[PDB]
Design an enzyme around this catalytic site. Structure first.
Site, PDB file in Angstrom:
ATOM      1  N   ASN A  66       7.775  -4.621   8.948  1.00 44.75           N
ATOM      2  CA  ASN A  66       7.096  -3.143   9.858  1.00 44.75           C
ATOM      3  C   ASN A  66       7.294  -3.955  11.666  1.00 44.75           C
ATOM      4  O   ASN A  66       6.419  -3.681  12.238  1.00 44.75           O
ATOM      5  CB  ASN A  66       6.006  -3.039   9.854  1.00 44.75           C
ATOM      6  CG  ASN A  66       5.016  -2.282   8.528  1.00 44.75           C
ATOM      7  OD1 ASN A  66       6.234  -1.876   8.239  1.00 44.75           O
ATOM      8  ND2 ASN A  66       4.576  -2.463   7.900  1.00 44.75           N
ATOM      9  N   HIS A  95      -5.111  -0.980   0.364  1.00 45.53           N
ATOM     10  CA  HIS A  95      -3.895  -0.647   0.493  1.00 45.53           C
ATOM     11  C   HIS A  95      -2.350  -0.734  -1.032  1.00 45.53           C
ATOM     12  O   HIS A  95      -2.051   0.239  -1.029  1.00 45.53           O
ATOM     13  CB  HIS A  95      -3.050  -2.484   1.158  1.00 45.53           C
ATOM     14  CG  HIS A  95      -1.432  -2.417   1.553  1.00 45.53           C
ATOM     15  ND1 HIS A  95      -1.280  -2.632   0.955  1.00 45.53           N
ATOM     16  CD2 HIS A  95      -1.331  -1.573   2.740  1.00 45.53           C
ATOM     17  CE1 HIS A  95       0.328  -2.336   1.813  1.00 45.53           C
ATOM     18  NE2 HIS A  95       0.032  -1.555   2.667  1.00 45.53           N
ATOM     19  N   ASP A 141      -0.010  -5.924  -4.581  1.00 48.00           N
ATOM     20  CA  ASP A 141      -0.319  -5.809  -3.896  1.00 48.00           C
ATOM     21  C   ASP A 141      -2.321  -6.575  -3.978  1.00 48.00           C
ATOM     22  O   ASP A 141      -2.810  -7.482  -4.582  1.00 48.00           O
ATOM     23  CB  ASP A 141      -0.736  -4.146  -3.781  1.00 48.00           C
ATOM     24  CG  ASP A 141      -0.664  -3.933  -1.724  1.00 48.00           C
ATOM     25  OD1 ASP A 141      -1.335  -4.181  -1.198  1.00 48.00           O
ATOM     26  OD2 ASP A 141       0.340  -3.505  -1.551  1.00 48.00           O
ATOM     27  N   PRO A 199      19.088  -9.750  -1.348  1.00 49.04           N
ATOM     28  CA  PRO A 199      19.851  -8.911  -1.978  1.00 49.04           C
ATOM     29  C   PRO A 199      20.038  -7.707  -3.344  1.00 49.04           C
ATOM     30  O   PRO A 199      20.016  -6.926  -3.033  1.00 49.04           O
ATOM     31  CB  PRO A 199      21.257  -9.114  -1.550  1.00 49.04           C
ATOM     32  CG  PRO A 199      21.552 -10.728  -1.858  1.00 49.04           C
ATOM     33  CD  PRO A 199      19.469 -11.405  -1.648  1.00 49.04           C
ATOM     34  N   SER A 216       5.633   0.273   3.631  1.00 43.98           N
ATOM     35  CA  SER A 216       4.852  -0.382   2.363  1.00 43.98           C
ATOM     36  C   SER A 216       4.464   1.478   1.328  1.00 43.98           C
ATOM     37  O   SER A 216       4.463   0.849   0.542  1.00 43.98           O
ATOM     38  CB  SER A 216       3.607  -0.345   2.298  1.00 43.98           C
ATOM     39  OG  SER A 216       3.434  -1.983   3.745  1.00 43.98           O
ATOM     40  N   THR A 271      17.319  18.768   0.397  1.00 45.17           N
ATOM     41  CA  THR A 271      18.236  18.209   0.966  1.00 45.17           C
ATOM     42  C   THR A 271      17.874  18.363   2.487  1.00 45.17           C
ATOM     43  O   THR A 271      18.871  18.412   3.339  1.00 45.17           O
ATOM     44  CB  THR A 271      19.107  18.972   0.818  1.00 45.17           C
ATOM     45  OG1 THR A 271      19.228  20.533   1.009  1.00 45.17           O
ATOM     46  CG2 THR A 271      19.645  18.748  -0.625  1.00 45.17           C
ATOM     47  N   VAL A 275      17.854  -7.516  -5.118  1.00 46.04           N
ATOM     48  CA  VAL A 275      16.327  -5.865  -4.795  1.00 46.04           C
ATOM     49  C   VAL A 275      16.762  -4.457  -4.090  1.00 46.04           C
ATOM     50  O   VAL A 275      17.940  -4.996  -3.733  1.00 46.04           O
ATOM     51  CB  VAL A 275      15.076  -6.748  -5.305  1.00 46.04           C
ATOM     52  CG1 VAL A 275      14.411  -8.160  -5.814  1.00 46.04           C
ATOM     53  CG2 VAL A 275      14.882  -7.119  -3.535  1.00 46.04           C
TER      54      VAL A 275
HETATM   55 CA    CA Z   1      19.750  -4.636  -2.193  1.00 42.97          CA
END
Ligand code: CA
Ligand code: CL
Length: 279
Positions: free
Chosen positions: A161, A69, A39, A175, A224, A16, A177
Site C-alpha cells: 500500500n 485484519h 495473518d 515472481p 490486503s 465484465t 507467486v
Molecule cells: Ca508472478
C-alpha cells in the site's frame, strides 16, 4: 447461483463491467479446496464462517485474533455473505501479533509450516495460501514464498500500500507467486496500490465489506483486501478443475478482464480478476 445485493467486489469479480450488485458463481463454491490465511488469526466462531474455519498454528501467546485484519481477509476468501468461495475450508496461521506486526523470522516459519501441514489435511481440490502482508525487500522472505508455491500451494500475496513499485517489497517482489494489486469500484487503481512489472493481477481492494472480530463487519481498504479475492477465486476455479495450484495465477491472468482499469502506469498489467461464469 447468484447473490443479490452482494458487496461490490464480489459482483465485480463476476461481471465484465462495473456498477453491478449481483455475484454470479457456480454453486460448487470451492467445496473440497482449502485456503490458508496467514495473518493475525481468524475468529473461527464467527457465524459467517459456518464452522468452516479453524486455527491450526500460532506463534504468540494465543491463537485468538485480537486485531480483525485476518478475520476480514478470511471472510473475503469464503465467508457466507462476503466470500468468494463460500464452501471452502479455511485454515488460520497467526504470524502477526494483535497490532498487525511481526518479525520476518516468524513469517518465514509460518510459510514453511503451511508447506508441511497441508499433508495432514483433506483438500482433494487443492490448497491456497493468502498472505495479506509485506514489508521491505528480503530475499529470505521471497525464498520462503517460492518454497511454498513450489510445494504445490497457490500462493497469493499483496502488492503493498505504498503507491510505489512492488520491486522493493517482499514477498510481493517474488515472481514465482501471485502478486495482487488493488482497484476501486470505478475500475481505477487504488490510490495507495503499488505497481510494477512483478504484479500479476488486480482485485477489489477499496471499501471492501467483510467480517470483523466480535461477530461484526466493517469496510476497509488495502491490497490486503484484494489478495483474498484472488485467493478465493483460485480455490473456486480449482474445485471446478479448470486449473491447478501451479498454474492458477497464470490461468486467472489469461481469463481476466483486460484494459478496464485506469491510472495503470506503463509497464504494469491491466488485468482484473474475473471468474467468467456462465449459467
Ligand atoms: Ca508472478
Ligand atoms: Cl527462507
Amino acid at each position: 447461483a447468484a447473490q443479490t445485493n452482494a458487496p461490490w467486489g464480489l459482483a465485480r469479480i463476476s461481471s465484465t463491467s462495473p456498477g453491478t450488485s449481483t455475484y454470479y458463481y457456480d454453486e460448487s463454491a470451492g467445496q473440497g479446496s482449502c485456503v490458508y490465511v496467514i495473518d493475525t488469526g481468524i475468529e473461527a466462531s464467527h457465524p459467517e464462517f459456518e464452522g468452516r474455519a479453524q486455527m491450526v498454528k500460532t506463534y504468540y501467546y494465543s491463537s485468538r485474533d485480537g486485531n480483525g485484519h485476518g478475520t476480514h481477509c478470511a471472510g473475503t476468501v469464503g465467508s457466507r455473505t462476503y466470500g468468494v468461495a463460500k464452501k471452502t475450508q479455511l485454515f488460520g496461521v497467526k504470524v502477526l501479533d494483535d497490532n498487525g506486526s511481526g518479525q520476518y523470522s516468524t513469517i518465514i516459519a509460518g510459510m514453511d509450516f503451511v508447506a508441511s501441514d497441508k499433508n495432514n489435511r483433506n483438500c482433494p481440490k487443492g490448497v491456497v495460501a493468502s498472505l495479506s502482508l509485506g514489508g521491505g525487500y528480503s530475499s529470505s522472505v521471497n525464498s520462503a514464498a517460492a518454497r511454498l508455491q513450489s510445494s504445490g500451494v497457490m500462493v497469493a500475496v499483496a502488492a503493498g500500500n505504498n503507491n510505489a513499485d512492488a520491486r522493493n517489497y517482499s514477498p510481493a517482489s517474488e515472481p514465482s507467486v501471485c502478486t495482487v494489486g488493488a482497484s476501486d469500484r470505478y475500475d481505477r487503481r487504488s490510490s495507495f496500490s503499488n505497481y510494477g512489472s512483478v504484479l500479476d493481477i488486480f482485485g477489489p481492494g477499496t471499501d471492501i465489506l467483510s467480517t470483523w472480530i466480535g461477530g461484526s463487519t466493517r469496510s476497509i481498504s488495502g491490497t490486503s483486501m484484494a489478495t483474498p479475492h484472488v485467493a478465493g477465486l483460485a480455490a473456486y476455479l480449482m474445485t471446478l478443475g479448470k486449473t491447478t495450484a501451479a498454474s492458477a495465477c497464470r490461468y486467472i491472468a489469461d481469463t481476466a478482464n483486460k484494459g478496464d482499469l485506469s491510472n495503470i502506469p506503463f509497464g504494469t498489467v491491466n488485468l482484473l480478476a474475473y471468474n467468467n461464469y456462465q449459467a
